[PDB]
Structure formats: structure tokens, C-alpha cells
Amino acid sequence: ARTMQTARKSTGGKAPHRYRPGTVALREIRRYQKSTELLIRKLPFQ
Amino acid sequence: RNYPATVHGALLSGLREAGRIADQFLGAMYTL
């Protein structure tokens, strides 16, 4: 085999999930623009 | 097997079989 190669040795063969900032904000925009429920609390306002 | 067609291969094969024959016909005192 290559153990007998004395010159010109043949070397061929051997060796949680986070959302991006701004996404939840936009989703909140979509959520409250569809609804009409009051946003400010009732008792602190009173 | 590991050193075929070489000088050292035949050298080790001679050492091997010499040890094999001696353990066979003289007994092995180191295996106990």
C-alpha cells in the first residue's frame, strides 16, 4: 500500500421566542381599531 | 494484518508466533 511509497507520497484518499419590536404594537393597533369599548377606566375617571 | 509486505511486519509476526508457541508448549504463568 501507500506505506511503501518512499517518494511522491500519494495523499489522495486519506486525511422562549420573542417577537421583533413593533409587531405586538401594530397588532394592538389592529385590535383596538376594530373595537369601540372604552379604554380609560371608569372609576379613576369618575 | 496491520503491516503487510514490510520488514517490520515480518519482524512482528516472528515475535507474535514465537510468543504463541512458547505459551502453547511451555505454559503461561502471567495469565493466572
Ligand SMILES: Cc1cc2nc3c(=O)[nH]c(=O)nc-3n(C[C@H](O)[C@H](O)[C@H](O)COP(=O)(O)OP(=O)(O)OC[C@H]3O[C@@H](n4cnc5c(N)ncnc54)[C@H](O)[C@@H]3O)c2cc1C
Ligand atoms: C523487491 C522487494 C523490495 C522490498 N522493499 C521493502 C522496503 O522498502 N521496505 C520494507 O519494509 N520491506 C520491503 N520489502 C519486504 C521485505 O524484504 C520482507 O518483509 C522480508 O525481507 C521478508 O521477510 P520474511 O522472513 O517473512 O520472508 P522470507 O525472508 O522470504 O522468508 C522465507 C525464507 O524461506 C526460504 N525458503 C523459500 N522457499 C523454501 C523452501 N522450499 N524450503 C526452504 N526454505 C525456503 C527463503 O529463502 C527465505 O529465507 C521488500 C521486498 C521485496 C521482495
